[PDB]
Design a binder for this molecule. Sequence first.
Ligand SMILES: Cn1ncc2c(NCCCS(C)(=O)=O)nc(-c3cccc4n[nH]cc34)nc21
Length: 822
Amino acid sequence: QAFQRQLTALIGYDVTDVSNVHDDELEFTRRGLVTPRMAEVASRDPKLYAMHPWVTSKPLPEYLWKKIANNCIFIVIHRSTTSQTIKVSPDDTPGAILQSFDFVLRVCGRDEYLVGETPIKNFQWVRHCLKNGEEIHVVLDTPPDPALDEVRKCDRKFRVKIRGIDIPVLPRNTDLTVFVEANIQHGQQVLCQRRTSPKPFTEEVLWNVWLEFSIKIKDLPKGALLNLQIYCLLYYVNLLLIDHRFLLRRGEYVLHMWQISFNADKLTSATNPDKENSMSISILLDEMPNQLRKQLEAIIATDPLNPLTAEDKELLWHFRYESLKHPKAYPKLFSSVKWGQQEIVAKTYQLLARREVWDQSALDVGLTMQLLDCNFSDENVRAIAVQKLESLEDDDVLHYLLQLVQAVKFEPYHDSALARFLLKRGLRNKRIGHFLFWFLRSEIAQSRHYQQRFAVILEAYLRGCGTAMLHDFTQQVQVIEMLQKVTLDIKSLYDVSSQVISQLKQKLENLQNSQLPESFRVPYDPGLKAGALAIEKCKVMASKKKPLWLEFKCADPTALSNETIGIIFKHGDDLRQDMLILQILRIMESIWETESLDLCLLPYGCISTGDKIGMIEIVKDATTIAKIQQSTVGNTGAFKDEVLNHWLKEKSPTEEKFQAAVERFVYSCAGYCVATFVLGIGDRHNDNIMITETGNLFHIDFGHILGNYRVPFVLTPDFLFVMGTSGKKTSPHFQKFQDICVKAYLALRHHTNLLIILFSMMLMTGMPQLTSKEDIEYIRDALTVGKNEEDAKKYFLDQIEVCRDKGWTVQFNWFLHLVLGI
Ligand SMILES: Cn1ncc2c(NCCCS(C)(=O)=O)nc(-c3cccc4n[nH]cc34)nc21
């Protein structure tokens, strides 16, 4: 019992609670997930699961090959005080290196292991070292005891009666009228729509009206939603017309509704938990011709957001067997399906049974993701997408985990192939499981629309993750809860007075002494194990949301460097938006990796842990672009061109390193101009832009520009100065920048459909305010869909020149708005 209690505290929600249900789908899902859990648990290798080797099967990039002398790679092994280097070949296994040198090779300071039958080059930690030009240091010790991971042992027209609506208290807006709109939805595609006669808007409105729809009962598709909405659009709520047992929903229902276009929340089957304040509604249920081929291929070629006309759909359907031969035609083909007709759906299933071309096609994530969005409610359609995902290596799963977790919001039922898939992969791998936990917990904490479903999924995971991880989560959760309290208490108290800096270090003193865990895993970096705080370095930050600047020691003695673990705790913004933006950045990098391109992005760790509150990784040796200018000229926005180049020469001791910084800067600057333009978040105040002492540029605080959402992006003259240019001039570096940009840009366009679906999904599940048809179709233009590589190339170069023609104009403007208040 104290176990289900522990689960509830780790989850942040009671999954056994049944106060907010009108059926047993949630409980049914708890039971159904048991099998999938035990199946994955009872078939994972204890040793490999305990050490969770982080590896990849992708080729080693060109830019990481040129980092290797010979077929040689050095690795420093450590034991007690002894310590020796070793010459290794990129292609030999960890076992080989051992005999070349029962113990195992663990990385210093990290809970990371170099184990398994894979080349030494196919490890992420090794590749990380090479990229950063770091040296691989491992300590030789015994493998973690796999025991520590032990797990606790019929032809009628459909009709619905609208009894009426009840609300305890209605807005002070006298006086208006209300009618109820009942839609039978599927995908976001409304099959049939009926309304009630308007009625005076009182706290109780009774119609007692039968709304007879055009669609026969037998023609109702599994997963179809009875969407009930109130107009003056004030309220909405949904009811699956066909339940989780293939039964036709029947009987009396009193649904509490959500108060207020492409938002995923509008899809939920969850009813509003707040029964005392929410609006309530009461209902009662009782050889193809040459030309046509071209036309079809042109249709199949268009982007995911390109709308299908009636003719387009009729064509796709009539030639469905020809369309079936094109995996890329699936999303559009299944959109051309009349789900409101049982005969058609039946034929669609007959079609799916002929999945030779699909089953054999190479995995296209962008394509797979499309079948998992709000446009598809059929579980058989969505199942083939999940099928293709099964072939993903744990490496790629981590890449798309966040948005796969978000895609669960588009599932009609709590129990889905997507859910079970995430459950399985999370249980198969500790790293995946770790992030799955936080991603789900993130949603469960600030999403009433989906907390129930995600809570049931999280519970299933926790019951199979193992004793060891359950303990880590417990420590991580405890720490986060304590620090959040401090961040809130501190926020309640401009300049960070002594009275507050004293209070902070004071509060931290109270916690550290006999309260906070002696050690905990860094949520955004599972390998790292944080120890005791360094109160001296801790401070409240000069931010309008008074974020905590915290620094910990590494609990790992074998750790090499003495550098502390820096974490920023912050309340005020929804960090989920930041997560999605940062995750996309990693996706853009992996993409660029396939092309062997390396823009030096810094997708720092960021984890949403609660309501408008989460933690951020502190990148070391970095400062604001604005701060580097506030030094030269403070109160006035008198930005000077050369200051940035000065700051670098200053921080780089050997002038050589300086040239390396100016290079790192040109790479990092191009990557952020391209990546930021595609995402339409490139117009930022230089306060939201930082640079490393090594010249690595990177944006920050993405939740800020998305919470209040004119130059294409930020290529200010001070950046240009570092590139050796001013005004009507060029360079050997600027040409380089313009060179890398067009490269980086053109490369992204080779994955247009992937970016589009991710961007679209990001907006619907993460940016509730940015959910219009126009908001989404921005990335189409940004990626200049359907354009020659030449045209596109020019398009971006125009964008660059527009930043030139602007100089400090917008920056200064930002200075007027943010800095002061104009
Ligand atoms: C990721 N990272 N690394 C350093 C750093 C930082 N450094 C603070 C020092 C800046 S200074 C003192 O040089 O002006 N501030 C922030 C940051 C602050 C506020 C909101 C944010 N959202 N996302 C990141 C945010 N992120 C940072």
